[PDB]
């Protein structure tokens, strides 16, 4: 059973904009890129396919600077396919991920891992989803960051 992926972005302030524009190593490439004009939840959809839906995680942050989180998904079984929705909040985000992004302009990248042991090499998913850009100046000038 393939999965339908979605990301509910429940920002509390100026969210920003997605940008899956640049081309990278296309390993199990993304079949769909979507969005939503909603107000409180700027949900995104990417109905892709993978091989092994055991290791399933959403790493959001800066890969080169080594500040990334780990978000588990919200699974739904209807009888058709899998429904994997991971709800990312803005406010609860770690302080460093906000302070660094605020001080240094770099797009917060999103990565999705779908994998397991049984699959053969290169059959599992590890790729770049989107790049959020921060807008609001909420960044304390004296913090442990």
């Amino acid at each position: 059973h393939v999965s339908f992926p979605s990301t509910a972005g429940k920002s509390r302030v100026m969210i920003g904009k997605v940008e899956p524009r640049i081309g990278i190593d296309e390993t199990v490439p993304t079949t769909i890129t979507v969005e939503d004009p909603n107000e409180v939840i700027q949900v995104n959809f990417a109905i892709e396919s993978t091989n092994k839906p055991f290791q399933n995680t959403l790493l959001i942050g800066l890969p080169n600077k080594n500040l990334e989180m780990a978000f588990e998904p919200e699974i739904k079984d209807n009888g058709k396919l899998s429904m994997y929705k991971y709800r990312i909040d803005l406010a609860k985000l770690d302080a460093a991920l906000l302070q660094e992004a605020s001080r240094s302009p770099e797009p917060i990248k999103a990565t999705l891992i779908l994998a397991s042991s049984t699959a053969k090499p290169k059959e599992n998913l590890f790729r770049e989803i989107l790049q959020l850009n921060l807008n609001f100046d909420v960044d304390h000038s004296d913090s442990s960051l």
Binding site: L59, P63, E68, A119
Partner: protein
Amino acid sequence: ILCMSSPGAVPNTIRLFLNELGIYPSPKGHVIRDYFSPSSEELVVSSNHLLNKYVYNARKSEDFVFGESSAALLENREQIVPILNAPRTSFTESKGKCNSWTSGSQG
């Protein structure tokens, strides 16, 4: 001091002493797994994950064999020196139902 504690061979006094230092290793029964690895037999890590050139930075690329290994969480202390972290796609698997100890670069 030099300490070693692998899954299945982790003491309690060493774990407590490291907890007093701000280093929290995974307990017994928790192991590191990485599927996007060039090694299917054991755990292997390249020199890309070296984190301090004043301890060791390889003049040319290399990879280190680790096998069944563990990971630790660190605090924001001036005295802690991270040397080698877990691969980005790695994760902690527990035999029981324990929430994953670590995940990605935070191990």
